[PDB]
Amino acid sequence: FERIAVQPLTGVLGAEITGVDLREPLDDSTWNEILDAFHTYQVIYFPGQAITNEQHIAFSRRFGPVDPVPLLKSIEGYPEVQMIRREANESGRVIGDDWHTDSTFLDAPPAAVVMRAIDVPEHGGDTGFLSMYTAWETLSPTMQATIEGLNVVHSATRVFGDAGDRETVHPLVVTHPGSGRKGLYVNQVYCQRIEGMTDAESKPLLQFLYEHATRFDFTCRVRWKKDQVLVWDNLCTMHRAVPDYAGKFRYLTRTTVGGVRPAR
Amino acid sequence: PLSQRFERIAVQPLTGVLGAEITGVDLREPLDDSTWNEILDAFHTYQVIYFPGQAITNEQHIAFSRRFGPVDPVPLLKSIEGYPEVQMIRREANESGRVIGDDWHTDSTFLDAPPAAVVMRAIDVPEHGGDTGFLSMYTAWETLSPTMQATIEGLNVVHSATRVFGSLYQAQNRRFSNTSVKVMDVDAGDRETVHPLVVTHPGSGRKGLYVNQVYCQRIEGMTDAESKPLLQFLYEHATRFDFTCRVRWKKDQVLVWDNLCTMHRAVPDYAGKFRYLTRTTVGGVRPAR
Ligand SMILES: C[C@@H](Oc1ccc(Oc2ncc(Cl)cc2Cl)cc1)C(=O)O
Ligand SMILES: O=C(O)CCC(=O)C(=O)O
Ligand SMILES: O=C(O)CCC(=O)C(=O)O
Ligand SMILES: [Mn+2]
Ligand SMILES: [Mn+2]
C-alpha cells in the first residue's frame, strides 16, 4: 500500500484506512488499493470523512451500481441515501439487532453497503462484523466436503412476510466474484431450510452453522465516530447492531451497492 | 458527567454495557486515597478497566494488584523467575497447541473461593490479533425475564476443573503446551464444589449470573439431561454479542477484570506471532447469594 495507509483491526477481518480524502475523485492507483484492501479485509472504514450526500453516492458507485435495499426510508431529495436513525426518545427494538447480512431473499442480494456516521454517541452503538470466509475455512475438511453441495432456501417471511413470502435458493457456500474466495452463506434471519431436506433434518444443521459462524473469534467490533465512512461486503460478512445506547440519539446514512446471483 | 464526577482520573467507557479506559494516573507510584477510591468506583461500575501506557516493573504490578486485595495465584499457571505472584499468559510464535482460555469463562471457579480479580499486563503483543473479549454477568442476569429469574434464582451449580486438568481433560486430545501451564494432579482437577447460580457482588452489592461452560458440570440435584438445556440456554444468553466488549492490547497496557461479575475469552487470531502478557490474581471470598 503506497497510496493509502491500512491498519488491520483483527487477525480475521476489518481495517482502518487513512491517507485519503473521500471528498475528492479517486485516481486509478488509489481506487485500486482501496478495492484491494476491501477484498482482503472485508470491512473497511475511513475516519474523518465529512462527505456530502452527493460525495457519498459517488464513492459508492465505484463499487458498483447503487441499488437501494427495499425496506429502508430515504432522506428527502436522495432516493439512494437511506437512513439508520434512532431518536433519543425512541424505545423498542433496534434495526438489525441479530447477526445477518442484508436482503438475501433477493435473487441477487446487495454486494456491499456504504455507511456514513452523521450523529453517534460518544460510546454505545458499535456494529459487529464477522467473516464468512473464516467461518468456512475453520470448518473441518470433512464437514466442508459434507455440506459444500447443499443449497438453502431464503425468504423474507420473518422480516416483512407476498413479496415477503417469495422464496429463492442460494448455495450454502459461495465463491466471491471479486476475491475468488469461498465463504459460508447462511443467516438466521432469511434462511428457511436446506433445499431437499425435512424440517427435522435441516433445523439442527442450520442451527450449528449459525452457532459456528457467529463464534466470537470470527468477529470484529467497529466503534463509530462522526464522519466515519464504512464499507462492508454483503456477500462474505455478516453484521449485527448493538442496542447499548438507550436514551441517546444515533443517526447514520447508507447507500446500497447492487450485486449478482450468489454462485458456487 | 464522568469528566466532573472523576477528579483524579479520566474515564472513557468502551461500550454501553462494560469496559472503560482509564488515564491520568501513574501506576509506577503508590496511589493516594482519593485516586484509589476513584479507580475502585470505576472498577465497580465498568467491571473491566484498562490503563494504556503504563510501563511498570514486576514489583509495581504486584503493588497495584494488592490494592484490590491479597494476591492468590491461580493453580494452573506458571510464574516468572523470582516472582511467584506473577504468572504468564505466554504463547510462542511457533506453538500450535490449544490456546489458553479460548472460550467464554471466568477464572478458577472450581475453587471454594475463586479469584476476585485479575490484573493483566501486556509485555509483547501483536500489532493486530489477540484481542480479549469480556461480558457482563450483571447484564446477563438483568435481561432475563421475570419468570426465568424466578425459576432459576434459587439454584446451585456444581463446578470442577475436570475439563481443564482433570479426568475429562486427560481423556481427550487437545492439550496445552508447557509454556504457561503446569502439570496438575488429576484428583485436584476432578474435585467438585457447589456455588449459587446467582450471586451478590460484595463490592457493588449487585446481583449477577454465575455460570460458565468451562467449569460448570451440572445444576446441583439435577440429572445431566435436565441440566444440559438450562445451562446451555444460560451460556447462549450470557454470551450474546450485545452483552460483550472487545479489548485490543498494546504493549504496557494494564487491565483489571472483575472475576465474579464478568466472563472473558481469548481470541486465537494471531497464528505465527509471539504473544506475552503477565498477570497477578487477586484472592476472592466464597461466592454467595
Ligand atoms: C488460568 C485459567 O485457566 C484456564 C485455562 C484454560 C482455559 O481454556 C478453555 N477455554 C475454553 C474451553 Cl471451552 C475450555 C478450556 Cl479448558 C480456561 C481457563 C483459570 O481458570 O484460572
Ligand atoms: O445500526 C447498525 O449498526 C447496523 C444496522 C443494520 O443492520 C443495517 O444497516 O443493515
Ligand atoms: O489470553 C487471553 O486473552 C485471555 C487468557 C485467559 O483466559 C486468562 O488469562 O485467564
Ligand atoms: Mn443489515
Ligand atoms: Mn481466564
Curated annotation (Swiss-Prot), chain A:
Induction: Repressed during growth on high concentrations of 2,4-dichlorophenoxypropionic acid (2,4-DCPP). Its EC number is 1.14.11.44. It comes from the Bacteria. Fe cation binds at H100, D102, H239. Inhibited by divalent cations, most significantly by copper and nickel, and by diethylpyrocarbonate (DEPC). Optimum pH is about 6. One of its GO terms (cellular component) is cytoplasm. Keywords: Dioxygenase, Iron, Metal-binding, Oxidoreductase, Plasmid, Vitamin C. Belongs to the TfdA dioxygenase family. PANTHER family: ALPHA-KETOGLUTARATE-DEPENDENT SULFONATE DIOXYGENASE. This is (R)-phenoxypropionate/alpha-ketoglutarate-dioxygenase.
